[PDB]
Amino acid sequence: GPHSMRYFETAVSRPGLEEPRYISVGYVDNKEFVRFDSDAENPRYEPRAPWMEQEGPEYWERETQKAKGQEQWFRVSLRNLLGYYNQSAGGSHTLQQMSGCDLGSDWRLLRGYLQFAYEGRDYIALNEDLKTWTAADMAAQITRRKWEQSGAAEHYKAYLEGECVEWLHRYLKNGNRTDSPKAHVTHHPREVTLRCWALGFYPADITLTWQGEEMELVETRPAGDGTFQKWASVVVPLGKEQNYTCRVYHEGLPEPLTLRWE
Amino acid sequence: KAVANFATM
Amino acid sequence: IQKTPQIQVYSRHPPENGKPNILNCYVTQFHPPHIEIQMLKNGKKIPKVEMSDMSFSKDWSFYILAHTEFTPTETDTYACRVKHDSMAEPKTVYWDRDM
After folding, report:
1. Which of A260, A210, A218 is nearest to A234 (CA)?
2. What residue segments make up the domains of chain C, in order of their start?
3. Cβ of B9 and A69 within 8 Å?
4. Domains of chain A, with CATH numbers?
5. Around Cβ C60, how many Cβ atoms within 10 Å?
6. Phi, psi for residue A244 in degrees, rounded to 5
7. Could you please report the per-residue DSSP string of chain C?
């Protein structure tokens, strides 16, 4: 099937705090595999999956040193943004970045990603063409023009098509499953409530329906054990239980599960 | 491997 | 601008009185990332509350999982109390074994 790599990076300023806290987290197929936190005693990228311990000391030295470079980057950019938005000293501020690559099942590059947010809101993103930028805000135009004049896009493109694809290939060999949902319905004395539960599944993505014709739900939640939970409920007249069926749709299923109150 | 950004904002 | 935390309180394994389990407090969709999460047992703070590393979603909002060892009697009340800049008062949500 398809594959992906992402790095999610955060820098956070607070009022007194001399310097900002920088965190970088790396994901391969949405599972965390490396992490760097400048708050740590010895700040460095650590393996986050046993299959990463196999990387030599060159890996950890080069990656750790890159992260220190990012910390500074985020530090300087955090200063610039303050000025761009005519913000003053005394506030808390956040700068975020997502970057990485999507591969198809053939392992070819489907899509590069490079996006940034300031105060949790879209700031500037590299378009899918990997050549042009989108930047909504007026303040963002100082950066867009700066980055057009500097040819940054070409350099982000080179990383996205080269190094990102290349090391994901490597990681995927070193890292060598969907857990299906077990479903069941519960009964609660609302006129009664039918609650279709879904449990033990991975990945989180899932749909639950209630029926004949096409309801309360909860957001998908982690069990804490790597797997996910969800439920969905409807209010139903008494005795009229069997007239209602729940369908669960998940990628790990051979076909959608069908259930009723039993 | 992580990207190392280019020009600052 | 702040986004107010969404909170769910629930157990890892289907609930059974006397039998060990884990109580989760899942806090999502908030900004900024500074947050205080407490878990409560009959009104009393639970001591060894495990906190996941904070992460963020593709919409740039932050999320985090607090959990703790707990044993669910018929009589005990469990809550999660969240304090965050987006809310003037701390927000409390109670464990409901059926949700």
Report:
1. A210
2. 1-99
3. no
4. 1-177 (3.30.500.10), 178-259 (2.60.40.10)
5. 22
6. -130, 125
7. --BPPEEEEEESS---TTS-EEEEEEEEEEBSS--EEEEEETTEEPSS-EEPPPEE-TTS-EEEEEEEEE---SS--EEEEEE-TT-SS-EEEE--TT-
Which residues of chain C are within 8 Å of residue A120 when distances are taken between CB atoms?
1, 3, 31-32, 60-61
- The alpha carbon dihedral of A257, A228, A30, A9 has a sign of positive
Report yes or no: A143 and A124 within 8 Å, Cβ to Cβ: yes
B and C make contact (3+ CB pairs below 8 Å): no
Rounded Cα gap, residues A88 and A218, in angstroms: 40
Choose the CATH number for C1-99 among 3.40.50.720, 3.40.30.10, 1.10.760.10, 2.60.40.10. 2.60.40.10
Chain A closest-CA separation from residue C46 CA (Å): 18
SS3 content of chain B, % helix, strand, coil (to 5): 0, 0, 100
Task: Note the resolution in Å, 1 decimal.
Answer: 2.4
The helix, strand and coil proportions of chain A, stated in percent and rounded to the nearest 5, come to 25, 40, 35
Q: What whole-number distance in Å separates Cα of residue A106 and Cα of residue C9?
A: 41
The neighbouring-strand residues paired with A86 are none
Output DSSP code: residue A105. T
Cβ atoms within 10 A of the Cβ of C20, count? Answer: 11
DSSP-assigned states of every residue in A53-92: TTS-HHHHHHHHHHHHHHHHHHHHHHHHHHHHTT--TT--
CA distances to A206, A227, A241, B3 from A132, in Å: 34, 38, 56, 18
